[PDB]
Amino acid sequence: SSGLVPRGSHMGYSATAPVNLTRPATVPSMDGWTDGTGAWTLGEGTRVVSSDALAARAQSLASELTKFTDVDIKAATGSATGKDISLTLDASKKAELGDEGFKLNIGSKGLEVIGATDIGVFYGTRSVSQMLRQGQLTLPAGTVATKPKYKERGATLCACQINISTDWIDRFLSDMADLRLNYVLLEMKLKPEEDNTKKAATWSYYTRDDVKKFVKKANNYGIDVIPEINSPGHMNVWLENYPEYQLADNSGRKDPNKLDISNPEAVKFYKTLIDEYDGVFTTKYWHMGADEYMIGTSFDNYSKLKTFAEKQYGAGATPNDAFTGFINDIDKYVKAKGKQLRIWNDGIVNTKNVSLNKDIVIEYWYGAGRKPQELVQDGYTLMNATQALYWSRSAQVYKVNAARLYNNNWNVGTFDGGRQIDKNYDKLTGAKVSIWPDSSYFQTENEVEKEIFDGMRFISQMTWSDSRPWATWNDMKADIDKIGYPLDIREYDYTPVDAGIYDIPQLKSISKGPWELITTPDGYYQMKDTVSGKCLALFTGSKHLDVVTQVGARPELRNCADVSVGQDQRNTANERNTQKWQIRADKDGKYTISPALTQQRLAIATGNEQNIDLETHRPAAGTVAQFPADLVS
Ligand SMILES: CC(=O)NC[C@@H]1[C@@H](O[C@@H]2O[C@H](CO)[C@H](O)[C@H](O)[C@H]2O)[C@H](O)[C@H]2[C@@H](O)CCN21
């Protein structure tokens, strides 16, 4: 017989270790590891030891490691033993480590993590968590120091028109932290509450309380959450109810997507929104978008902007000048609030009388138009937001192919359309992936989460390490899978109730029930009415992005769709996903039911809910309808 038995190494340091014991992988990679003698084992009695200042980081790391390892790991202050993980903040090491980098020393003093900042220590602890959560509790001795090549590393998350649940955003933020990603551009609506903007409080929106909460979580993770309110284009969700601010074409037809930048009350409305955001985001940036103002048309159809340009910026001024002038004016405005402005690059147009301010960060996604190398020559600060790093729920042209990018040698200087710039350009800030909803019924947010996994690891690797230590993408993939999600994602209770037969009094206006609940692979439920044999759907109402956003829309019974299939079944996506329901448990015990696509909450209508949509249609009082959570708590 083989005699196979667990090795069962003693906890702490051992001078003996096999020469080729695996060093568990991390993402980002920690390049330039220097091997030392022996190995260190996490085991019974191992503690995370730190100063008082780092106590919170130590306690959190101990708790997490206890969960992953099944060993009771406690935090402590005072002296560390070779059994222990030590956290050290040494701010004198800024040259070696920078604002975000860290050093690991693994040896007879235990596992030491050193950073020059709180975020640095935290980022070192992410590698420690990654290394210890792969079923191996012995780590080869040695040392490494690592810091990110680029300062901004992250994602555009367009939580726009449709709502991305705050629970999803919290998970997203935990995933970003695991991956040492420090940037999220969040295009979203913060619920407008002043008399002069409140008619734009249509769904999707986020409450001030909800934003304050995820910004606080982000900041603890070293993540800069930058808001975007796109302007002067893509303004439908803001101007629908304010036709007075919409731009009319030569024939007098207004577009709810277009802000009239010649109307000073329209510009003031935009600035009012900036002021509303300022109370809840902590970032020093403002992103105003400036993409696709004239999509589906041209400035020739808006002669009024030419007229405005000439008045404002002198004879010969063009609509491009007026557009750039609006950008420069928003720059002036947010600077005076201590912020730096950011735009999308298609906002950079050929001007005559006005020139675009060079203190504006350019996030470059669109390679038609002024080329990267040209902007380099100009001296602009640039972030790589290539379309190669896009996902869309509906536009299948936009699915990140991490394999292809890894194998083809993309790096952060590889701008849109494969146009290379010097990756060491001293004003290249970094790079990001971008997560766009577009026609939104094709994929649930949970399917989005599954799909983006590989691409998030790819961008993490190339923005921090800018190296390819895995021989191929497939080698990377095997290690990223072994590393897995951070604790918070593993803990999220996607489906808190068992499949089965339920009485659901909230649904009595639809059927007396009972209801058969079954779970879906994306972490939702289908709810079948045992009376009619049909399934509950949120199907009907006014939409944005082909998803029902109408506050007060009522659910309905429809023939049962097959909820067991994946997102490649595009032909049935709408019937399927309109039949998916998210069930959450209260603090504590009570359950809420939300349409998976809309992320509003079912409630019995009282007739006292207050919202712009409800001024013009209300569900019959006492019937069950969807509402944003803030109108029904
Ligand atoms: C920078 C970006 O690529 N802009 C152009 C478009 C994206 O447009 C956004 O669409 C969302 C809704 O999905 C918002 O309305 C936002 O204001 C727009 O900027 C679009 O998502 C994406 C891809 O479809 C391809 C082109 N970009």
Residue 444 phi, psi (nearest 5): -75, 160
Supply the residue whose CA is at minimum distance from atom 10 of ligand 1: 438
Is the C-beta atom of 436 inside 6 A of ligand 1? yes
Q: State the distance from the centre of ligand 1 to the C-alpha of 436, rounded, in angstroms.
A: 7
CA trace torsion 286, 288, 291, 296 (10° rounding): 160
Neighbours of 179 (CB within 10 A): 27
Is there a binding annotation on residue 194?
Answer: no
Distance from C-alpha of 563 to C-alpha of 575, rounded to nearest angstrom: 9
Helix (H) or strand (E) holding 406: helix 402-407
Query: What is the β-pairing status of strands 152-159 and 183-188?
Result: parallel
Atom 17 of ligand 1 has which residue's CA nearest to it?
234
Could you give the 3-state DSSP secondary structure of residue 544? strand
The verdict on whether 363 is a catalytic residue reads no
Q: What is the CATH number of domain 492-632?
A: 2.80.10.50
Which ligand 1 atom is the nearest neighbour of the CA of 228? 17
* Under 8 Å between Cβ of 99 and 76: no
* DSSP H or E stretch at residue 383: strand 382-384
Choosing from 44, 100, 244, 292, the catalytic residue is 292
State the fold for domain 147-491: TIM Barrel (3.20.20)
Q: How far apart are CA 376 and CA 388, in angstroms?
A: 20
Q: Tell how far the Cα of 289 is from the centroid of ligand 1, in angstroms.
A: 10
* Beta carbon of 291 within 6 Å of any ligand 1 atom: yes
CATH topology of domain 10-146: Chitobiase; domain 2 (3.30.379)
Asked whether residue 209 is marked as a ligand-binding residue, the answer is: no
**How much distance in Å is there from the Cα of 438 to the middle of ligand 1?**
7
- Distance between CA atoms of residues 628 and 594, nearest Å: 10
- Gap between the terminal Cα atoms of the chain: 64
* Residue 362 in contact with ligand 1 by CB distance below 6 A: no
Residue 598 to residues 175, 534, 537, 545, 620, Cα–Cα distance (Å): 23, 21, 11, 11, 20
Contact present, 597 and 441 (Cβ < 8 Å):
yes
Give the residue from 557, 599, 601, 600 showing the smallest Cα distance to 579: 557
SS3 611: coil
Method used to obtain the model: X-ray
Measure Cα distances from 552 to 117, 131, 236, 375 in Å.
48, 48, 20, 48
Task: Give the C-alpha separation, 578 to 88, whole Å.
Answer: 50
Query: What is the Cα–Cα distance from 377 to 386, expressed in whole angstroms?
Result: 19
Q: Which residue has the tokens 């050193």?
A: 114
CA distance 190 to 438: 20
Q: Whose CA is nearest to atom 4 of ligand 1?
A: 291
DSSP assignment letter at 190: B
> At which residue do the structure tokens 């593993």 appear?
490
Q: Where along the chain do its domains lie?
A: 10-146, 147-491, 492-632
Q: How big is the CA angle at 184 (ends 181 and 186), to the nearest 5 degrees?
A: 165
Spatial distance between the Cα atoms of 113 and 103, rounded to a whole number of angstroms: 6
Q: How many Å apart are CA 527 and CA 556, to the nearest integer?
A: 11
Which alpha helices (DSSP H) does 40-180 contain, by range?
Answer: 55-69, 94-97, 118-132, 166-178
Query: Is 187 annotated to bind ligand?
Result: yes
Could you give phi then psi for residue 369, rounded to 5 degrees? Answer: 85, -175
Residue nearest to atom 13 of ligand 1 (CA): 438
d(Cα 449, Cα 427) in Å, to the nearest integer? 31
